[PDB]
Structure formats: C-alpha cells, structure tokens
C-alpha cells in the first residue's frame, strides 16, 4: 500500500532526493573528516563520534583501510559507513583478484558511489548516510583524495572536509593548503584545520604515503601517534 513508504528513491519538487539531502544533513552533523593531498600521499583526519573519558579508543571509528593503497575517512553514520567499507574492501580485493593490480582509487570510489546511488535510485531503501574521504594511490593518478556523498556523487579534492563545520575546514584549507606539501606539512595542516574547526583522543588520523620502492602504504595513526601529532601542534 506504501502508506508509510517514504519514497526514498523519489525526486522532490526541487529535483532533489529528499532522503539523500537528509543523509547529507546527517553527515554535516557528524564528526569532521578532513583530507589533505600532499606530494606523495594523503592525510585523512576524522573526529571520533564516540568519545569521552569512559570510551576506549581501541579502533578507528571513522578511519578504514580499504586496501594497501586506499584508506577512507567517514563522516556521518559509522554503521552504513562500515557496510560501505566492507563493500569497498571486497571490491578492491575483487579488482586485485581479477587484474592482479591494486584497484585504481577512482574505480573503488566509483564502486562505493554506485552502491550509494543504487540506493538513491532503486529499491525504496534509505540511502547510505555516509560521506567518504577516500584517499588512495594508483599508478594512473598518483595519490588521490575523493569526497563521496550519499547521492553517489564523488569528486577529487587536493584538500577537502566533511562533517561538522566542514565549511570552516574548507575555508582554512583554501587559506593554508599548498601544492607539493610534505607528509609532515599536510599532517600539520590537517591537525590545524581539525583544531580550528573543533583533543588527540577524539581525533584519529590515517596517512596514505607512496614511496617509490615500498609502494603505497596506509597507516592509520593509533592513539599514541595521534597524541604525538597533536602535541607537535
């Protein structure tokens, strides 16, 4: 009967999928996740959703390694973000299995975004209320950072920010982001943006770095590493 159906995959008078717009709002009310693309790699830095003196910072709530060459930061619902992270990991491994090559970052982004968009356009199910900052490396586009939203729309960003106070982080990145940054410089910029738009415990970091011989490596900074990075700032 669809009496209580919300018509999730239905346009609104303005031509917007209301469920996708509300998912975007949910993201904008979530912890800030900033991505900064430096010379060889990308620094992702997210605000943990679940913090407090009684919370145990054992795992990255928002940072999720997708593959040896791709890491992600989450803004919004960490649950459906985890679902899409599982799908992204499976897609990267399927690409590796098919081609014996690490999935190009844009293809993994396209896959997760096609999942999101399939939820926005078919099935009458709510969209994934998560925005991903997918940092990655591939031989084609070098090191990349992609911002993906619940609509399934993604774009490459040298630097960007999502979540709470994402506009302030974006403005700070515009003011201070420079090309050809070093890993240290980009980490400092991300820490500065996070602090200016918001504590090491609450914050989590992940540096993708491409070395010529070692390849692309994802390193999600632990509590102690993030504490050291914050104290450096």
Partner 1 sequence: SSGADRYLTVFSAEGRLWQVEYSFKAVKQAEVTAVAVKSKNAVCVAVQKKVSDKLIDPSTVTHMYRITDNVGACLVGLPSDVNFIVMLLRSFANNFEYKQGFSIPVSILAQMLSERHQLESQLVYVRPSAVSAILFGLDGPSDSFALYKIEPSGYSNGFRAVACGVKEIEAMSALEKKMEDFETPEATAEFTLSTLQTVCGVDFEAQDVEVSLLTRDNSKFSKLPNDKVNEILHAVAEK
Partner 2 sequence: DISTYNGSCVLAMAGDHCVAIASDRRLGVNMLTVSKDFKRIFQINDRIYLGLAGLATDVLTVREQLRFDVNLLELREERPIDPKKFMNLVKSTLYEKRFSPFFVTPVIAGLLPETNEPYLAASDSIGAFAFPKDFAVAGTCEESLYGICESAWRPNMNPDELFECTAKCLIAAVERDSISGWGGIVYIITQDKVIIKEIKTRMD
Partner 3 sequence: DYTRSITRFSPDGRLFQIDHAHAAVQRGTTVVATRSKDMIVIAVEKTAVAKLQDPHTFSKICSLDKHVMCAFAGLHADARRLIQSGQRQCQSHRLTYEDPISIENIARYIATLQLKNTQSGGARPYGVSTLICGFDDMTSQPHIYETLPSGTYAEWKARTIGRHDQTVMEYLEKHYKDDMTDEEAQKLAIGALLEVVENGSKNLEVAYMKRGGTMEIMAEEVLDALIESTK
Residues 4-43 binding partner 3 (CB under 8 A) are 5, 7, 9-17, 37
Query: Considering beta carbons, is residue 93 or 182 the nearer one to partner 2?
Result: 93
- Burial code (b: 16+ CB inside 10 Å, e: under 16) for 9-36 equals beeeeeeebebbebbbebbbebbbbbbb
Region from 3-11, 28-36, 64-72, 100-108 binding partner 1, contact rule CB under 8 A: 3-11
Contact call for residue 79 and partner 1 (CB under 8 A): no
Q: Contact letters (x/-) for partner 3, 51-90, by CB under 8 A? A: ----------------------------------------
Integer Cα distance of 74 and 32 in angstroms: 9
The entry of partner 3, partner 2, partner 1, none that residue 137 binds, CB within 5 to 8 Å by partner kind? none
Report residue 123 CA to chain centroid gap.
25
The entry of partner 3, partner 1, partner 2, none that residue 160 binds, CB within 5 to 8 Å by partner kind? partner 3
Contacting positions for partner 2 (CB under 8 A): 59, 65-68, 86, 89-90, 93-94, 96-97, 100
Alpha carbon separation from 67 to 43, 111, 134, 168, 207 (Å, rounded): 16, 14, 11, 30, 13
Tokens of 50: 């679940």
Binding test (CB under 8 A) with partner 3, winner from 38, 95, 132, 177: 177
Side-chain half-sphere of 140: how many Cα atoms within 13 Å?
Answer: 8
Tokens of 16: 């917007």
Cβ contact 135:208 at 8 Å: yes
Query: Considering beta carbons, is residue 23 or 226 the nearer one to partner 3?
Result: 23
Residues 6-65 binding partner 1 (CB under 8 A) are 6
What values do phi and psi take at 38, rounded to 5?
-105, -170
- Site residues (CB under 8 A) for partner 3? 2, 5, 7, 9-17, 37, 106, 110, 113-114, 116-118, 120-125, 141, 144-145, 151-160, 170, 173-174, 177
């Amino acid at each position: 009967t669809y009496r209580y159906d919300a018509g999730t995959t239905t346009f609104s008078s303005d031509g917007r999928i209301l469920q996708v717009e509300y998912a975007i709002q949910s993201i904008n009310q979530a912890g800030t996740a900033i991505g900064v693309q430096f010379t060889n790699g990308v620094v992702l830095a997210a605000e943990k959703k679940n913090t407090g003196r009684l919370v145990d910072y054992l795992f990255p709530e928002k940072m999720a390694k997708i593959d040896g060459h791709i890491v992600t930061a989450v803004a919004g619902l960490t649950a459906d973000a985890n679902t899409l992270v599982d799908l992204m990991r499976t897609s990267a491994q399927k690409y590796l299995k098919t081609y014996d090559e690490q999935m190009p970052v844009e293809q993994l982004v396209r896959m997760v975004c096609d999942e999101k968009h399939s939820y926005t356009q078919y099935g009458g199910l709510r969209p994934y209320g998560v925005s991903f900052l997918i940092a990655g490396y591939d031989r084609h586009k070098g090191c990349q950072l992609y911002l993906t939203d619940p609509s399934g729309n993604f774009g490459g960003w040298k630097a960007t920010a999502i979540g709470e106070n994402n506009q302030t982080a974006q403005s700070i990145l515009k003011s201070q982001y420079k090309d050809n940054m070093t890993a240290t410089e980009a980490m400092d910029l991300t820490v500065k943006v996070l602090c200016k738009t918001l504590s090491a415990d609450k914050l989590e970091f992940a540096v993708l770095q491409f070395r010529e011989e070692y390849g692309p490596k994802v390193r999600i900074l632990t509590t102690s590493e993030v504490d050291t990075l914050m104290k450096r700032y």
